[model samples]
Target: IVGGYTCGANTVPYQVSLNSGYHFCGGSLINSQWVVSAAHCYKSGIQVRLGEDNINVVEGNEQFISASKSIVHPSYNSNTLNNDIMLIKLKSAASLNSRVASISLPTSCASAGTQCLISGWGNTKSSGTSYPDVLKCLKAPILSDSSCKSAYPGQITSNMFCAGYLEGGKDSCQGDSGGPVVCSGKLQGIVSWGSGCAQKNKPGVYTKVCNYVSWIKQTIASN
Candidate 1:
């Protein structure tokens, strides 16, 4: 995360690191058996590490579980990055505790200008390699769909939203994909893509989680 602070232990209980021997993406534990992440982060043989704060060290609270299955949105478009959301079913249910828990899906859409918290272990710099060992978080406000489109003409879709400073300061960077954009204790967005890390007129784009709540529930029920 660019221009953010390290998250306190257990502060982001729902956060999980998508690992393939190393931290590759961030995800939110939505239930004991499922996690929500960006479709672009999908890969075979992924392991979900829950109750994580630092990636470089083994914390006693950490629970690593392999993925049993993964479902990407049927209409997910890689070119436009629309519907960039995915669900990963764990091999077994996570044992919930103070340092490990699930986050609620959005009950309603977060309005533009709502300040949200974004946490991740992605690169701290846009140009060079600077991944953080500890999870980092930033506070950014959601931008209107119209303004977001203006910033990235013909790129922003209804299924996606932008958040961050237009003047450029804080944002989710590379390897942060699939992380949570939480607002009012709800999972509001999923870090999907962006023009760059915290650049002027370019903000972090996220999958609008409110739009996928029904799909998430239905997918889980059937599977």
Candidate 2:
């Protein structure tokens, strides 16, 4: 997370790390047995780590569980990055606690100018390697669809929205993909893609969680 601060331990309890030996992506615990993340992060035999603050240290609150199943949106497009969300069913239900819990999913779409909090263990620099061990967070405002379209012409889709500074500074970068973008205390977006780490006029784009609420619920219920 470029231009962000380290999150307080246990403050963002819903945050989870996607690991296959090491942290590769971030996700949010939506329930005891389900997690939401970017579709692009999907890989077989993934391990989900809950209540993790620092990746390098052994945090007592951590809960490591394997993914039992992963479901990417049926309409997901890799080329356009549309419908870039995915759901992972845990092999076993997580033990909820102060340091490990689920976050509420958004019932309504977020509008432009809505200030959101994005957290992850992604890179801290736009150009170089500076990934942080501790989780970091940035406060970014959701950009209007029109503004986002202007920035990434012909790339913005209804299932995607942009957030960050137009002049550049803060953003969720590599390793941050599939992370949570909490707005108004709900999971509103999932870190999906961006032009660069945090380039001018190239705000970070995210999967619009509101657009997939029904699909997520139905998928979980049927499975």
Candidate 3:
């Protein structure tokens, strides 16, 4: 669960930070040692606010865990923005309990037009600021690889997946990057770059996690 997935930690709520010091978005625990998030999150000093309900109220719980290492996709070209996913390695293994649980990544998908879920603390506006703590989750349908490629050729590399409402309106925008696009309880995609927030004719681009399974395993195995 790289995108917007949170562990059921009772006394702790992880703090997601961006490079600019603004609270950007959310992330989820994927394994005891690995966390999946957008490669763009590397621009921030990721500190896990372990052991609190929220950053605001730190009454009985207060702990900040440093991000041990960040592994962005090697093929990620900032210019094209493909393979825009990353797996962060925690120095120590997270708890086995629900306080930390890994979400299953999609080993396979049914079809190109599968419905998926995406959640984030972003606005639906194409250009504007982010929304409040109340993260927004939306349902959208994946388009055929051909359809997506046809829409944004060369730019839409094999490392990426695309999905959105063909009719338009609901979508993920700024601050929604690195969020999850789960389908059938499996992480099928991750929010990456888009033409604009909720812009019609332009679908939201996501990272193809399935394509990075080997990269993820090799990266995690070393640590």
Candidate 4:
């Protein structure tokens, strides 16, 4: 079963709508206090929608929060996308009703065989960079760290964990960059990168929440 309203095993998967009409990716809700997403999304200008099943419909109970400030880590490297994460301070906290929720961050880096759930309006197939209006969800099994170690080599830093199917055409695409990689009903990872949306021998990359506990906690606490 999925976790909350209009979603399941869904952490902070969101729609990052730029007033300019372009979208970069998704994100995760860490607590009643914060949201975790890619710094790249924040740079583009965005309005966040939460506790809503459809981008088009609020259903009367969801929290459609606009952001007040975006705290991208000071060390973010725009070129390499390192320190790739950011936390959005919602203008108001969301109520954990049917739509709003806090996905549990796993205490450890998820291991192989863990089935991760990802969601977005990203293309079910990788043909372009744009996303759809409605939400789409997918599943990919976690890859062993040793296996991920071989694939990313230098690029797969400890900051991230890898998960996805290798059959060649399944992944969290262009618009899924900052979304959740949920497993066992909790969020374990956040979309980081991939060779492309879905490609042969390539698994989507993600930042491991376990590694960011300190930053995630301290950031929320400070805010």
Q: 134-199 in candidate 4: lDDT tens per residue?
A: 566777788888877777677777666777766656777776677777888667777777777677
Worst 10 residues of 3 by lDDT: 11-20
TM-score of each: 0.98, 0.99, 0.80, 0.83
By lDDT rank, best first, the candidates go 2, 1, 4, 3
Off by over 4 Å in 1: none
State which candidate has the highest lDDT: 2
What's the lDDT for candidate 3? Answer: 0.64
- lDDT for each candidate structure: 0.93, 0.94, 0.64, 0.66
Residue pairs in steric clash, candidate 2?
none
What is the full ranking by TM-score, best candidate first?
2, 1, 4, 3
Candidate 4 is scored at a TM of: 0.83
Off by over 4 Å in 4: 1-24, 57-59, 128-130
- In model 2, which runs have C-alpha deviations exceeding 4 angstroms? none
After the best TM-score superposition of candidate 2, give how far the Cα of residue 217 lies from its true spot, in angstroms: 0.6
> 2 or 3, which is superior by TM-score?
2
- lDDT digits (tens) for residues 157-220 of candidate 2: 9999999999998889999999999999999999999998899999999999999999999998
Can you write out model 3's per-residue Cα lDDT over 1-223, one digit (the tens) per residue? 1122332334112222222345564555567667777877675466643333333445454344557788888877777777777887666775554333467766775368788777665665555554544435677888888878876767788778778865557677776677677778787777788776666677788888888777877887887
